[PDB]
């Protein structure tokens, strides 16, 4: 067996395994504790596994949130930092709320951080919002966009249906059968 990756995190490892299995590549996960997880494959599949890891840019980056740029541990704070933290916490709380709706598997939401102008003198601008979501198979997407728009409109002081973009997609086919072992 050939070593593909070492020192992975748990959440990196399971995403790699998922992507290899989808292409019929049997992979193995090994735990070394303080050294993390390692992924290995057979020689006949090594070439393909390399090509896929390149194409998907694996292992995945950790997930960014804007609050990470303005740690509350800072020795001092300007108004800009506080306002940024605020908006970055509202975005997360809305994604966590949308996942509770019926049929939604996951979603992501974005807000107009107009904070980059600290509104010294200048009046504020209106908010804009964007959202993505994935649905279970057999969902009438057209009829479900309305609910999302209705829900988001009232979460802010001034939003127009024109200023809300919503993009929906269905779950892909289920991977239930196991890959074949090299002869």
């Amino acid at each position: 067996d050939k070593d593909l990756l070492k020192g992975l995190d748990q959440e990196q490892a399971n995403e790699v395994i998922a992507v290899l299995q989808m292409h019929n590549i049997e992979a193995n996960k090994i735990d070394s504790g303080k050294l993390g997880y390692s992924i290995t494959v057979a020689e006949p599949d090594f070439t393909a596994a390399v090509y896929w890891i390149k194409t998907y840019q694996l292992p995945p980056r950790p997930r960014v949130e804007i609050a990470q740029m303005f740690p509350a541990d800072s020795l001092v704070s300007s108004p800009r930092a506080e306002k940024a933290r605020l908006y970055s916490a509202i975005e997360q709380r809305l994604e966590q709320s949308l996942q509770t709706m019926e049929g939604v598997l996951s979603a992501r939401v974005h807000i107009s951080y107009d904070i980059d102008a600290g509104e010294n003198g200048r009046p504020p601008k209106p908010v804009h919002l964007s959202a993505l979501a994935v649905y279970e198979r057999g969902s009438p997407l057209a009829h479900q966009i309305s609910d999302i728009k209705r829900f988001l409109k009232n979460s802010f002081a001034d939003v127009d249906y024109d200023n809300i973009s919503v993009v929906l997609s269905e779950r892909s086919d289920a991977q239930l059968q196991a890959p074949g072992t090299p002869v």
């Binding site: 292409h23 006949p44 393909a48 002869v183």
Partner: peptide
């Protein structure tokens, strides 16, 4: 691609 992997591996 699920099929082509079988052939290209040479099973």
């Amino acid at each position: 691609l699920w099929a082509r992997q079988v052939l290209a591996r040479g099973d």
